[PDB]
mmCIF file of C-alpha atoms and ligand atoms in Angstrom:
data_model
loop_
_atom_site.group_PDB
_atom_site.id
_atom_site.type_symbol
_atom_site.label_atom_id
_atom_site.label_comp_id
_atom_site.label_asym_id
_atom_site.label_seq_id
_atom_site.Cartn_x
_atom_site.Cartn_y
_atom_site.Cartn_z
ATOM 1 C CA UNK A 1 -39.429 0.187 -32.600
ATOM 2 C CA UNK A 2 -36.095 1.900 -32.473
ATOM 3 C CA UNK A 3 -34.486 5.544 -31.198
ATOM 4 C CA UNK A 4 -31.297 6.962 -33.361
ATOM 5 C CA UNK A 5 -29.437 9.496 -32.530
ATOM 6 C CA UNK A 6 -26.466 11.143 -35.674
ATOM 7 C CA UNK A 7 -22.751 11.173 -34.207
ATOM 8 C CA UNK A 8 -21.775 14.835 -34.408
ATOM 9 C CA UNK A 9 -18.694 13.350 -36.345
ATOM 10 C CA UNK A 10 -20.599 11.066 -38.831
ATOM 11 C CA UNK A 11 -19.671 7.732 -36.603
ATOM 12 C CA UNK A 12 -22.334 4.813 -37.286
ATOM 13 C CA UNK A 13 -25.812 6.391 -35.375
ATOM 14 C CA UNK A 14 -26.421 5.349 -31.684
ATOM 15 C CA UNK A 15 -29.434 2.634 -31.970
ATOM 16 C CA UNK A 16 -31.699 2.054 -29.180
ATOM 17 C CA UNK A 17 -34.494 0.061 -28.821
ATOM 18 C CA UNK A 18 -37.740 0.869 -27.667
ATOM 19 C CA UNK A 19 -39.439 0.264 -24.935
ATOM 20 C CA UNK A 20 -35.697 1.649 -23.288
ATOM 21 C CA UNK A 21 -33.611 -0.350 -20.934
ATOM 22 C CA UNK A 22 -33.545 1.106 -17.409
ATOM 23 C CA UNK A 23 -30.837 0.527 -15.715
ATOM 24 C CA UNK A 24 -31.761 1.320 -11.923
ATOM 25 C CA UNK A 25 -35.032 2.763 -10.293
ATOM 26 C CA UNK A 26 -33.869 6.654 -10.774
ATOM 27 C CA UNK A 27 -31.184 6.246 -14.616
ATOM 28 C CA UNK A 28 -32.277 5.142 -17.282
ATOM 29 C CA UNK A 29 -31.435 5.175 -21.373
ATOM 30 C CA UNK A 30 -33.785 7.966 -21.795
ATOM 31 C CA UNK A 31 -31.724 9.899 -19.504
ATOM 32 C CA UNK A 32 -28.856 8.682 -21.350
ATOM 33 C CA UNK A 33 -30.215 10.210 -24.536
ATOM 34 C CA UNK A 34 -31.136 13.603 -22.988
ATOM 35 C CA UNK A 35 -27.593 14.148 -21.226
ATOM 36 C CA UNK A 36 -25.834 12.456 -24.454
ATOM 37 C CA UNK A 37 -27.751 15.398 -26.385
ATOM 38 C CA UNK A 38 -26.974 18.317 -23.919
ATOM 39 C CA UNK A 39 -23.247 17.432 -23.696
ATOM 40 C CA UNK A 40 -23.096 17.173 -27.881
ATOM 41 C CA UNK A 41 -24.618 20.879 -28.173
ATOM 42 C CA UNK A 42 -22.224 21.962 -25.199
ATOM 43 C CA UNK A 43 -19.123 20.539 -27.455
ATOM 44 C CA UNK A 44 -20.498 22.408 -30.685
ATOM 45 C CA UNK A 45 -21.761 25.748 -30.532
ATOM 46 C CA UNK A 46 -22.949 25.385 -34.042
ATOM 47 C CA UNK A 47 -26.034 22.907 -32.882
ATOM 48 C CA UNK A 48 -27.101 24.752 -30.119
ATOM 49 C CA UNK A 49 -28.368 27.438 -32.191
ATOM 50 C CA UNK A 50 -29.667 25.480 -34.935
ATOM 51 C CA UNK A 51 -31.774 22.963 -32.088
ATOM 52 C CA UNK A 52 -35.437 24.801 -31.263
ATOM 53 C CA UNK A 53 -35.068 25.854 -27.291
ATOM 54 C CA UNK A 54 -38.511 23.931 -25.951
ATOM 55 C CA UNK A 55 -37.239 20.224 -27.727
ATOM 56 C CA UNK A 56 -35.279 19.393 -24.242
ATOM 57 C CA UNK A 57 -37.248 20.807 -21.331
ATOM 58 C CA UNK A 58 -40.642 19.808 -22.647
ATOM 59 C CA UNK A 59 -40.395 15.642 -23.316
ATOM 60 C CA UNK A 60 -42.239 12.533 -21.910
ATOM 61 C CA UNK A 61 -39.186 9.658 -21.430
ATOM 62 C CA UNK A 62 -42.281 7.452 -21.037
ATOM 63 C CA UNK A 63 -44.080 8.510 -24.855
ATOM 64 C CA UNK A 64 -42.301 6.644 -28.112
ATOM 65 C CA UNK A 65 -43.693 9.599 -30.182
ATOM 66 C CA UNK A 66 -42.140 12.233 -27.488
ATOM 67 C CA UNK A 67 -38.699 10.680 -27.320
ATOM 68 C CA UNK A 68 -38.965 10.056 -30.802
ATOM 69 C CA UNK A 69 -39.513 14.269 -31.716
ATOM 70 C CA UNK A 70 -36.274 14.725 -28.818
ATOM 71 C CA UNK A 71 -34.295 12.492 -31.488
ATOM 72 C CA UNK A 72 -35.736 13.619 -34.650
ATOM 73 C CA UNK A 73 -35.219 17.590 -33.575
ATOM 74 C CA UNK A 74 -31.623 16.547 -32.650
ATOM 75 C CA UNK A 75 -30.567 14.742 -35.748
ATOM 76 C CA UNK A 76 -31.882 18.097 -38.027
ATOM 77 C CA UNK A 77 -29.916 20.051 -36.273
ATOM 78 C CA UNK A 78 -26.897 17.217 -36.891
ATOM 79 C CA UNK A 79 -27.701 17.705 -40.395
ATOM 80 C CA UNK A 80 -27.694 21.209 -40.630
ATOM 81 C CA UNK A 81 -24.315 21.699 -39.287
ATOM 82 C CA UNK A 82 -22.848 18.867 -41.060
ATOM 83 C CA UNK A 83 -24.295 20.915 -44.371
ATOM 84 C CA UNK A 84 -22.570 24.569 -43.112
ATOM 85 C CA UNK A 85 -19.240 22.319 -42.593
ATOM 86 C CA UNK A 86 -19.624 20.969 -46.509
ATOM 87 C CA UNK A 87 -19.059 25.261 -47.331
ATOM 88 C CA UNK A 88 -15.610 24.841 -45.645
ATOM 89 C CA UNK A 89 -10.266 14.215 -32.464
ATOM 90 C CA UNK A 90 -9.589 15.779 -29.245
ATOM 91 C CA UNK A 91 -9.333 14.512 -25.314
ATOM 92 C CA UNK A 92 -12.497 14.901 -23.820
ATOM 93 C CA UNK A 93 -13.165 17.108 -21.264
ATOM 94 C CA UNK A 94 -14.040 15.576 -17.686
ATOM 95 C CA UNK A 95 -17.479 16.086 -17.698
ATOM 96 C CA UNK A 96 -17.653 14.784 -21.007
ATOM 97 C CA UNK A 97 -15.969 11.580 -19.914
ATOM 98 C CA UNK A 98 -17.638 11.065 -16.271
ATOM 99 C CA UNK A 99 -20.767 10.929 -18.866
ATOM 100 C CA UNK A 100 -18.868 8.269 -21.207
ATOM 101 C CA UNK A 101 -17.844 5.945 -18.432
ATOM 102 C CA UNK A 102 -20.953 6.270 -17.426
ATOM 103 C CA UNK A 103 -22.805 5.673 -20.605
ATOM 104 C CA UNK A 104 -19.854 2.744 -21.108
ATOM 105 C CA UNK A 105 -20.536 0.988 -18.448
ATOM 106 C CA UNK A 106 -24.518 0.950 -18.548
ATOM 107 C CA UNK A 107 -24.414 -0.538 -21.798
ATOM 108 C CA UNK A 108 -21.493 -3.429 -20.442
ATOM 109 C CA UNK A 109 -22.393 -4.277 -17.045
ATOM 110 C CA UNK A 110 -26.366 -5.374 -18.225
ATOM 111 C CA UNK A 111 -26.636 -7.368 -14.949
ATOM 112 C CA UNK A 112 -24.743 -5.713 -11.894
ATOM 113 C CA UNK A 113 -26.076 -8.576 -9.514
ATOM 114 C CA UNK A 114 -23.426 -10.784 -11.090
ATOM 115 C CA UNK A 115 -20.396 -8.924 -9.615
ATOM 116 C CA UNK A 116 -21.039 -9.959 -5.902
ATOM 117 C CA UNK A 117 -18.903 -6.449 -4.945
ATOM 118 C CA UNK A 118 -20.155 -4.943 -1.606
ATOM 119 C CA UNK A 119 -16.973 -2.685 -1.638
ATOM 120 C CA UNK A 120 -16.989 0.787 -1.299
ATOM 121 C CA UNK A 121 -14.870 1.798 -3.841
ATOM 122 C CA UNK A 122 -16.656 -0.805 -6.874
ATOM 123 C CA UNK A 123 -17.509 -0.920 -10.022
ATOM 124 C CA UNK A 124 -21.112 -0.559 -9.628
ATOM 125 C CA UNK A 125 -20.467 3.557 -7.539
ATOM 126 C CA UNK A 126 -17.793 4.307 -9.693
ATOM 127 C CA UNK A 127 -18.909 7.758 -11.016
ATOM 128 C CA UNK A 128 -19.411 8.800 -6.855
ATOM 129 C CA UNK A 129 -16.358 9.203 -5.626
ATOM 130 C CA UNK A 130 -13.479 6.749 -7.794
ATOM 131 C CA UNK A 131 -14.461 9.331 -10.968
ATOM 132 C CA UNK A 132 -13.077 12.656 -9.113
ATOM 133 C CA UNK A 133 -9.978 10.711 -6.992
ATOM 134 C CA UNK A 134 -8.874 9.350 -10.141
ATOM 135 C CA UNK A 135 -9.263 12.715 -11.721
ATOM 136 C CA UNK A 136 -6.995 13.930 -9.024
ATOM 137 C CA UNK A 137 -4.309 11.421 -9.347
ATOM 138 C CA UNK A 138 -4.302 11.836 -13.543
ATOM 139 C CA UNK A 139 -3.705 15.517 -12.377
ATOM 140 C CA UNK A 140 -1.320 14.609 -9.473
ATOM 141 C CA UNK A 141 1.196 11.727 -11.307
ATOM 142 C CA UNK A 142 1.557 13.493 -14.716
ATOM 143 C CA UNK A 143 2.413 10.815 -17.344
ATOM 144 C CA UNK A 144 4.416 11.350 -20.083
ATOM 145 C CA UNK A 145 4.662 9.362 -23.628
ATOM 146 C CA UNK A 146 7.468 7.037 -21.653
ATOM 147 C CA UNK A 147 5.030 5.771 -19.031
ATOM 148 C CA UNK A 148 3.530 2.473 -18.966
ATOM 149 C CA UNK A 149 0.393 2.255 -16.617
ATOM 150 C CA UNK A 150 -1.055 -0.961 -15.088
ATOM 151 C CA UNK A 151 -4.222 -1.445 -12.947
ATOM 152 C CA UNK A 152 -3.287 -4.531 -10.611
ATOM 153 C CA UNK A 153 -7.514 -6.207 -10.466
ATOM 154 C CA UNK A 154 -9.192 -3.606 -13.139
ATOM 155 C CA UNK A 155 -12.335 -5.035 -12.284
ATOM 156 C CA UNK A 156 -14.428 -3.862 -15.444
ATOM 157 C CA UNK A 157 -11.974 -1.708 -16.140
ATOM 158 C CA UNK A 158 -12.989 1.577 -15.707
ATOM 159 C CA UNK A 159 -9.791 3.144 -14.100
ATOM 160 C CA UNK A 160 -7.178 2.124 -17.477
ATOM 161 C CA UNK A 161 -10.260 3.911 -19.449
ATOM 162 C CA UNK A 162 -10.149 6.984 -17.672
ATOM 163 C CA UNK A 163 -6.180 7.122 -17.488
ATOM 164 C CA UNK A 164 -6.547 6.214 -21.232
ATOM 165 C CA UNK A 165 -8.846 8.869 -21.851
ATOM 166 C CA UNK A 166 -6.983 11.301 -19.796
ATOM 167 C CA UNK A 167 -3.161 10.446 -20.737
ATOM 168 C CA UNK A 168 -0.390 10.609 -23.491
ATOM 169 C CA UNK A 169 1.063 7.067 -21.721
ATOM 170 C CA UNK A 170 2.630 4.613 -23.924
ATOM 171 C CA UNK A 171 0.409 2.116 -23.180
ATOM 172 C CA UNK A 172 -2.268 1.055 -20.089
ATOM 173 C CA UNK A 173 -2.930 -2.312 -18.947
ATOM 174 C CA UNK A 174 -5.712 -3.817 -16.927
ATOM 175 C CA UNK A 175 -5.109 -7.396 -15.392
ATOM 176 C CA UNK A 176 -7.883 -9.019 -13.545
ATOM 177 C CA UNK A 177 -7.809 -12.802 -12.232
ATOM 178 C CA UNK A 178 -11.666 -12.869 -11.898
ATOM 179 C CA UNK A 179 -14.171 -14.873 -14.357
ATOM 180 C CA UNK A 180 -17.528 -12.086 -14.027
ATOM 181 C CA UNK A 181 -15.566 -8.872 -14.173
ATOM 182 C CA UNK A 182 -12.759 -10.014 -16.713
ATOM 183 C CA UNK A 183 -15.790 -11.281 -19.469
ATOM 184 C CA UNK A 184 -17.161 -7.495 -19.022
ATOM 185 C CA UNK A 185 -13.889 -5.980 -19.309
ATOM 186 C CA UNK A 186 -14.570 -7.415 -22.733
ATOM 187 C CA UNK A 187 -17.657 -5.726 -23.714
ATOM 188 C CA UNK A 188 -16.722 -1.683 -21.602
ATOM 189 C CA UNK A 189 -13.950 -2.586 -23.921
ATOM 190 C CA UNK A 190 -16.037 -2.522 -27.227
ATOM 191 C CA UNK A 191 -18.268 -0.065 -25.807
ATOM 192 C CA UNK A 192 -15.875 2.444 -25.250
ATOM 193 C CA UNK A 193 -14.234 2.577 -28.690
ATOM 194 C CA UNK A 194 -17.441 2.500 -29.715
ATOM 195 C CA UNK A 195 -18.732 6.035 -28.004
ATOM 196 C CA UNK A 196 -15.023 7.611 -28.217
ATOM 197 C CA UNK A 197 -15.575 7.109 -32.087
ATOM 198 C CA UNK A 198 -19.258 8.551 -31.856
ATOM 199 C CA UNK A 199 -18.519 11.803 -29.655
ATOM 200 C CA UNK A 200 -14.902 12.119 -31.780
ATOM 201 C CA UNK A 201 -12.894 11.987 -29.189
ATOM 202 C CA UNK A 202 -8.753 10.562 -28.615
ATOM 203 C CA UNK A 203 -7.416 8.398 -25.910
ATOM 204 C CA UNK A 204 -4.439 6.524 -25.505
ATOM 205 C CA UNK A 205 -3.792 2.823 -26.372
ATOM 206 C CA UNK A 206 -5.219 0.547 -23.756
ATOM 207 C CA UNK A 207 -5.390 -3.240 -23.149
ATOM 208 C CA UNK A 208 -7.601 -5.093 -20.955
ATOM 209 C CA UNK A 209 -6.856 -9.000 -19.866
ATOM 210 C CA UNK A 210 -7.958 -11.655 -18.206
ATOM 211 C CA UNK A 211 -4.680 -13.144 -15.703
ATOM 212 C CA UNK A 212 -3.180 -13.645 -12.255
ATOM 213 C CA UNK A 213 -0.906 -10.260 -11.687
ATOM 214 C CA UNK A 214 1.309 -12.823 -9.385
ATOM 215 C CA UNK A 215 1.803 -15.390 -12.146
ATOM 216 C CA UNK A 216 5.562 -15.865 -13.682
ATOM 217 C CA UNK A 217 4.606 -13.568 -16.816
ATOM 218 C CA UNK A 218 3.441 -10.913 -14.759
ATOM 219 C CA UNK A 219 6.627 -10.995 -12.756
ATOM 220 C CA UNK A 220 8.677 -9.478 -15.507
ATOM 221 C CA UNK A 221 5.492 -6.800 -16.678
ATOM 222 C CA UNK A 222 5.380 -5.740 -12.937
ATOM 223 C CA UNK A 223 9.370 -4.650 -12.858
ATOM 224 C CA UNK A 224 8.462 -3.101 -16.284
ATOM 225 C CA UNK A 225 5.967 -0.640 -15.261
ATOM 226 C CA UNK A 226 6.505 2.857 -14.454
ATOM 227 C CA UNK A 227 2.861 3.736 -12.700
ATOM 228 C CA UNK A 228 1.435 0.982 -10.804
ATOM 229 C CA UNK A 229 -2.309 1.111 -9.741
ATOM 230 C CA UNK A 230 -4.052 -1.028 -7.021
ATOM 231 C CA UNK A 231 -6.535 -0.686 -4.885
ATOM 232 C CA UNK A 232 -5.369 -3.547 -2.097
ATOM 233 C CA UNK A 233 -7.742 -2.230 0.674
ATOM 234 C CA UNK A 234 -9.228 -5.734 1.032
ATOM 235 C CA UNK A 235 -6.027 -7.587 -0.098
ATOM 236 C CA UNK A 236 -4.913 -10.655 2.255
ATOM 237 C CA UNK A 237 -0.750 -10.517 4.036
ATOM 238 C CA UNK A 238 -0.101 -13.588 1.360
ATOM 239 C CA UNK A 239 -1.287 -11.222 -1.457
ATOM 240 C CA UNK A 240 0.508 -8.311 0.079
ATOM 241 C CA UNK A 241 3.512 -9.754 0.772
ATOM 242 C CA UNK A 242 3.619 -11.209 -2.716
ATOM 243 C CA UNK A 243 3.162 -7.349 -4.577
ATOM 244 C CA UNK A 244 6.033 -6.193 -2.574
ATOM 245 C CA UNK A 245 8.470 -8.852 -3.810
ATOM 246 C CA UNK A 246 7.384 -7.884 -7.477
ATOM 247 C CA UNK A 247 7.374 -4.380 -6.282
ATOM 248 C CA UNK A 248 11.381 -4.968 -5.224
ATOM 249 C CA UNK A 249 12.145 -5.350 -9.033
ATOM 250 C CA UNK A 250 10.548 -2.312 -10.525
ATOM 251 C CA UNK A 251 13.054 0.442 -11.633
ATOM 252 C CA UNK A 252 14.325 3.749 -10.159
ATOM 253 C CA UNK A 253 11.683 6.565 -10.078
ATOM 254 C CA UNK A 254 8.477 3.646 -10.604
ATOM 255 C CA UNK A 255 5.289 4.835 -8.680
ATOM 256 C CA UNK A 256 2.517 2.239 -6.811
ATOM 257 C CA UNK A 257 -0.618 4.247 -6.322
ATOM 258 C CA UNK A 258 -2.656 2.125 -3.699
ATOM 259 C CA UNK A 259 -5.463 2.454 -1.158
ATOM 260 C CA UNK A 260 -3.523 0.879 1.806
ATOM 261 C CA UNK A 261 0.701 1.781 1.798
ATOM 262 C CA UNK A 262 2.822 -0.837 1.030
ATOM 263 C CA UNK A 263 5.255 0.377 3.473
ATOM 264 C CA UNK A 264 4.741 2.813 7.080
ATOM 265 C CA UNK A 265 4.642 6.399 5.968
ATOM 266 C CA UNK A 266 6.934 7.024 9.217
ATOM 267 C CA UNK A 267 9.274 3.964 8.082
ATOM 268 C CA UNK A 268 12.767 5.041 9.802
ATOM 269 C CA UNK A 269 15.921 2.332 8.161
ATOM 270 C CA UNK A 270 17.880 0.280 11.142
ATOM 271 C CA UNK A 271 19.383 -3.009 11.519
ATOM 272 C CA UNK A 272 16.530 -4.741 12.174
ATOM 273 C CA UNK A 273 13.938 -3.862 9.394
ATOM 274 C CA UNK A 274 16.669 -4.113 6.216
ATOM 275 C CA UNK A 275 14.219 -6.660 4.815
ATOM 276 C CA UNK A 276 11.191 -4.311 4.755
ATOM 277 C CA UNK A 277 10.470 -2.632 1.098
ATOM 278 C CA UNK A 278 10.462 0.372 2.912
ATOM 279 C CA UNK A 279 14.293 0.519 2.451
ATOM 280 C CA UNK A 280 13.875 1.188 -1.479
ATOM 281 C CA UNK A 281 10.287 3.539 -1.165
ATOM 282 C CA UNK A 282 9.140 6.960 -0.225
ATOM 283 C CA UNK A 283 5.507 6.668 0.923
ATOM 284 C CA UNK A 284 3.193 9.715 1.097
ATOM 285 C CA UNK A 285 -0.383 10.090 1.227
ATOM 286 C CA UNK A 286 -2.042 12.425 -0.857
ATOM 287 C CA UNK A 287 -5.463 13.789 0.131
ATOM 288 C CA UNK A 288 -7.321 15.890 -2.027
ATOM 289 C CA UNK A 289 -8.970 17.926 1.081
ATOM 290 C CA UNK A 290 -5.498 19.147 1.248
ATOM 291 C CA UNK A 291 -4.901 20.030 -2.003
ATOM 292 C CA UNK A 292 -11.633 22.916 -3.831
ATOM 293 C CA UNK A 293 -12.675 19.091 -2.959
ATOM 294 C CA UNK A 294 -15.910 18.773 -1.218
ATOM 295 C CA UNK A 295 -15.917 14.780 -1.405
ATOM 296 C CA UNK A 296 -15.770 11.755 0.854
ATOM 297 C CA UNK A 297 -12.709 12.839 2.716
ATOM 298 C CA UNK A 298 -10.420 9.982 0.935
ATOM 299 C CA UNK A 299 -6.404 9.859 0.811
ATOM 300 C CA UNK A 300 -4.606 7.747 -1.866
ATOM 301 C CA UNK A 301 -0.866 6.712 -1.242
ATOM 302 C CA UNK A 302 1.765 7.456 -3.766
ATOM 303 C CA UNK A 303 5.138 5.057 -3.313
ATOM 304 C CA UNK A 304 8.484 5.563 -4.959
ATOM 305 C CA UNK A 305 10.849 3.369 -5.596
ATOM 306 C CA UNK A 306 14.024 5.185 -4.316
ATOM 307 C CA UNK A 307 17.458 2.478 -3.847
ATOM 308 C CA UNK A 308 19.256 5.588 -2.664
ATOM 309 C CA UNK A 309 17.085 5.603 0.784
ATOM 310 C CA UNK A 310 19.369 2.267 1.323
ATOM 311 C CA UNK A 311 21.965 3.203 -0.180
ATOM 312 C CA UNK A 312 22.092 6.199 2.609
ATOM 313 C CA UNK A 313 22.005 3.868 5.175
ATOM 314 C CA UNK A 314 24.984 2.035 3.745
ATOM 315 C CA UNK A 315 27.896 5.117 3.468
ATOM 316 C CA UNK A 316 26.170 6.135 6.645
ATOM 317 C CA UNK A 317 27.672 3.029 8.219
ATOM 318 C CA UNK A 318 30.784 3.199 6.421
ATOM 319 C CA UNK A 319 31.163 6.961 7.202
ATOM 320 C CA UNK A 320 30.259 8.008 10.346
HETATM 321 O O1 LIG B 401 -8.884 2.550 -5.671
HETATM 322 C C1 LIG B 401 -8.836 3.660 -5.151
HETATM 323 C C2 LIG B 401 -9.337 3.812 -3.733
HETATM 324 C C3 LIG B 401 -8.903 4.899 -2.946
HETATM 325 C C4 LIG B 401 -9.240 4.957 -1.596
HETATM 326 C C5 LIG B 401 -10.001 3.926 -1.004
HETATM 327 N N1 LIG B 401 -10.346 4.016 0.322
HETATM 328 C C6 LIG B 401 -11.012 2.998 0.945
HETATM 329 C C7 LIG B 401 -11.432 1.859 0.211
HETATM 330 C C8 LIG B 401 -11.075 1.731 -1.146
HETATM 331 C C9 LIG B 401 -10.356 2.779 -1.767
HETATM 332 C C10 LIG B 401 -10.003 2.727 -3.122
HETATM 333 C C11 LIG B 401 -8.177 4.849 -5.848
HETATM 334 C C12 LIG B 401 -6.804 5.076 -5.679
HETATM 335 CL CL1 LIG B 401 -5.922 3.843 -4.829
HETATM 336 C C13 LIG B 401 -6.148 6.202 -6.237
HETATM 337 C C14 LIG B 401 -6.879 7.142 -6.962
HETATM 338 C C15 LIG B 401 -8.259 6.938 -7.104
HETATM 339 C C16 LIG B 401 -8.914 5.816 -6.552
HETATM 340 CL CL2 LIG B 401 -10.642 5.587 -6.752
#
């Protein structure tokens, strides 16, 4: 007892067994299989027309036979088109993806009791809120083919495979120290390739690990990268402290996208705070309700590293 559903690129089929795996008390794979469907014949025009109009508002998620005809119907009209393309890989689009990630993770994180996160910002409400202020920030920060991007604790990594899925950069990393979320990195991983092959859609190399980001090794990968992203909201003044010492070696023009700034946003050089990293960063806090967002109000702080901001402070002394 099985449901399949075609790739509308001629992937291996999605394979799901039966009775479906629910993943909370209101989403479920049947959902899964409904929305997969409607976003496919959004994508291609083509299918739309050849799919009968009653196959997706009249179903039963709870009959085999009825979720069986919702595949069947679907994979017809899969087969149709595929025959008018015989007569002669894109980015997806955000909806698209918020429905990936999604569909990603439900198939990854099997048992979200396991992650022991209570945060408001974790893996487990990604899609609320993290989805459309990551959005922002892809549409805010504007990599380029020369950028290297690096989640500081990807959890299960859903951040480096939106930026992936979003971006031209390089490459994007994902370090996280933790046992639970680093083994599940491994399977979004999978998962992810997986669906980006069945929907036909291109993203951007990506590599998740398992590792301390304040070991030796990461020392060196740290001064490296050109777009840093951590969410230190609940990060200790050891941790901190640490971060801004590796944050001292990146490179002119390097960017630290955080919850909490690494530095005051106010931060005014003197002779008494020539040890603070705030002599090397601009700090500002961007806020989507300030630049149509009708959200959690939530800000984001973009740092730059910026050696001229001491360097000012220098001829300033020298030249009066
Ligand atoms: O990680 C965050 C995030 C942001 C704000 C938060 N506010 C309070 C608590 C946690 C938080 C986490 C993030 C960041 Cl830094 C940039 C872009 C998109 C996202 Cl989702």
């Amino acid at each position: 007892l099985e449901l399949r559903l075609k790739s509308p690129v001629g992937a291996e089929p999605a394979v799901y067994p039966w009775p479906l795996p629910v993943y909370d008390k209101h989403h479920d794979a049947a959902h899964e299989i409904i929305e997969t469907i409607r976003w496919v014949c959004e994508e291609i025009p083509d299918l739309k027309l050849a799919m009968e109009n009653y196959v997706l508002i009249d179903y039963d998620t709870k009959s085999f036979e009825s979720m069986q005809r919702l595949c069947d119907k679907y994979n017809r009209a899969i087969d149709s088109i595929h025959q008018l393309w015989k007569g002669t890989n894109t980015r997806p689009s955000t909806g698209l993806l918020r429905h990936i990630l999604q569909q990603v993770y439900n198939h990854s994180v099997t048992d979200p009791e396991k992650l022991n996160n209570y945060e408001p910002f974790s893996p487990e409400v990604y899609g609320e809120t993290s989805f459309d202020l990551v959005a922002q920030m892809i549409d805010e920060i504007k990599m380029t083919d020369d950028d290297l991007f690096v989640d500081l604790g990807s959890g299960v990594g859903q951040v480096v495979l939106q930026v992936a899925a979003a971006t031209n950069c390089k490459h994007h990393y994902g370090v996280e120290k933790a046992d639970i979320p680093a083994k599940y990195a491994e399977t979004m991983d999978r998962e992810f390739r997986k669906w980006m092959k069945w929907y036909g859609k291109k993203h951007a190399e990506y590599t998740l690990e398992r590792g301390d980001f304040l070991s030796e090794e990461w020392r060196e990968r740290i001064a490296n990268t050109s777009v840093i992203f951590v969410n230190n909201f609940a990060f200790g003044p050891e941790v901190d402290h640490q971060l801004k010492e590796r944050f001292a070696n990146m490179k002119e023009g390097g960017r630290i996208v955080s919850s909490k700034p690494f530095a005051p946003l106010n931060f005014r050089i003197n002779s008494r705070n020539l040890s603070d990293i705030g002599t090397i960063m601009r700090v500002v806090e961007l806020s989507p309700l300030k630049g149509s967002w009708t959200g959690k109000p939530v800000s984001y702080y973009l740092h730059t590293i910026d050696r001229t901001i001491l360097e000012n402070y220098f001829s300033s002394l020298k030249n009066p």
